[PDB]
Amino acid sequence: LPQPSLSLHPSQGVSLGDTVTLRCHLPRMAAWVQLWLNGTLRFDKEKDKEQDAAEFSFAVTNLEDAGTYQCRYQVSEPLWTSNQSDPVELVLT
Protein backbone atom coordinates (compact mmCIF):
# COMPACT_ATOMS: atom_id res chain seq x y z
CA LEU A 1 0.00 0.00 0.00
CA PRO A 2 1.86 3.14 -1.26
CA GLN A 3 2.06 6.11 1.17
CA PRO A 4 -0.21 8.96 0.01
CA SER A 5 1.00 12.55 -0.39
CA LEU A 6 -0.82 15.71 0.63
CA SER A 7 -0.77 19.19 -0.82
CA LEU A 8 -2.23 22.42 0.55
CA HIS A 9 -3.49 25.35 -1.57
CA PRO A 10 -3.16 28.16 -0.75
CA SER A 11 -0.33 27.58 1.75
CA GLN A 12 0.94 31.16 2.26
CA GLY A 13 -0.87 34.17 3.75
CA VAL A 14 -3.91 32.09 4.75
CA SER A 15 -6.33 33.94 7.06
CA LEU A 16 -9.68 33.31 8.74
CA GLY A 17 -12.41 33.33 6.11
CA ASP A 18 -10.23 31.89 3.37
CA THR A 19 -11.04 28.54 1.73
CA VAL A 20 -8.26 25.93 1.65
CA THR A 21 -7.97 22.69 -0.28
CA LEU A 22 -6.03 19.72 1.01
CA ARG A 23 -5.50 17.35 -1.89
CA CYS A 24 -4.63 13.76 -1.02
CA HIS A 25 -2.89 11.95 -3.87
CA LEU A 26 -3.14 8.18 -4.12
CA PRO A 27 -3.44 5.30 -6.63
CA ARG A 28 -6.43 4.73 -8.94
CA MET A 29 -8.18 2.27 -6.62
CA ALA A 30 -11.53 2.84 -4.87
CA ALA A 31 -10.73 3.90 -1.29
CA TRP A 32 -11.91 5.72 1.84
CA VAL A 33 -9.64 8.73 2.33
CA GLN A 34 -9.09 10.39 5.72
CA LEU A 35 -7.86 13.86 6.61
CA TRP A 36 -6.18 14.05 10.03
CA LEU A 37 -5.38 17.21 11.99
CA ASN A 38 -2.84 17.13 14.88
CA GLY A 39 -3.05 13.32 14.96
CA THR A 40 -6.87 13.14 15.20
CA LEU A 41 -9.27 12.34 12.31
CA ARG A 42 -11.00 15.44 10.96
CA PHE A 43 -12.83 14.40 7.74
CA ASP A 44 -13.19 11.35 5.60
CA LYS A 45 -14.68 10.79 2.16
CA GLU A 46 -14.96 8.30 -0.70
CA LYS A 47 -12.56 8.40 -3.61
CA ASP A 48 -13.91 6.72 -6.75
CA LYS A 49 -11.40 4.37 -8.37
CA GLU A 50 -10.77 6.64 -11.40
CA GLN A 51 -9.83 9.75 -9.36
CA ASP A 52 -6.09 10.54 -8.79
CA ALA A 53 -6.91 12.30 -5.49
CA ALA A 54 -9.55 13.10 -2.86
CA GLU A 55 -9.80 16.82 -2.12
CA PHE A 56 -10.98 18.24 1.18
CA SER A 57 -11.97 21.86 0.68
CA PHE A 58 -13.17 23.92 3.64
CA ALA A 59 -13.39 27.43 4.98
CA VAL A 60 -10.95 28.49 7.70
CA THR A 61 -13.38 29.54 10.44
CA ASN A 62 -11.27 29.60 13.57
CA LEU A 63 -7.77 29.56 15.02
CA GLU A 64 -7.98 25.82 15.75
CA ASP A 65 -7.92 25.13 12.00
CA ALA A 66 -4.17 25.78 12.12
CA GLY A 67 -1.87 22.79 12.59
CA THR A 68 -0.49 19.60 11.15
CA TYR A 69 -2.50 17.96 8.36
CA GLN A 70 -1.98 14.41 7.11
CA CYS A 71 -3.91 11.95 4.99
CA ARG A 72 -4.39 8.16 5.15
CA TYR A 73 -6.40 5.81 2.92
CA GLN A 74 -8.03 2.40 3.39
CA VAL A 75 -9.53 -0.42 1.38
CA SER A 76 -11.47 -3.51 2.53
CA GLU A 77 -10.45 -5.91 -0.29
CA PRO A 78 -7.78 -6.68 0.84
CA LEU A 79 -7.99 -5.21 4.39
CA TRP A 80 -5.28 -2.63 4.14
CA THR A 81 -4.51 0.87 5.38
CA SER A 82 -1.79 3.26 4.26
CA ASN A 83 0.58 5.01 6.59
CA GLN A 84 -0.04 8.74 7.13
CA SER A 85 1.23 11.08 4.42
CA ASP A 86 4.18 13.35 5.26
CA PRO A 87 2.67 16.37 7.12
CA VAL A 88 1.61 19.74 5.65
CA GLU A 89 1.22 22.64 8.07
CA LEU A 90 -1.63 25.22 7.89
CA VAL A 91 -0.24 28.44 9.35
CA LEU A 92 -2.69 31.24 9.88
CA THR A 93 -2.12 34.83 8.98
Ligand X SMILES: *[C@@H]1O[C@H](CO)[C@@H](O[C@H]2O[C@H](CO)[C@@H](O[C@@H]3O[C@H](CO)[C@@H](O)[C@H](O)[C@@H]3O)[C@H](O)[C@H]2NC(C)=O)[C@H](O)[C@H]1NC(C)=O
- The order of strands in the sheet holding 19-25 is 5-9, 19-25, 53-59
Q: Is the peptide bond before 87 cis (omega within 30 degrees of 0)?
A: no
**CA–CA dist 72, 86 (Å, integer):** 10
CA–CA separation, 13 vs 29, rounded Å? 34
Closest approach of ligand X to the CB of residue 62, in Å: 7
**Identified binder of its own copies from the candidate list 9, 11, 38, 46, rule CB under 8 A:** 46
Tell the smallest beta-carbon distance from residue 14 to its own copies (Å).
Answer: 24
Q: Which does 79 bind (CB under 5 to 8 A by kind): its own copies, ligand X, none?
A: its own copies
Q: Determine the residue type at 35.
A: L
Q: How far is the CB of 90 from ligand X (least distance, A)?
A: 8
**Chain contacts with its own copies (rule: CB under 8 A):** 29-32, 40-41, 44, 46, 48, 74-79, 81
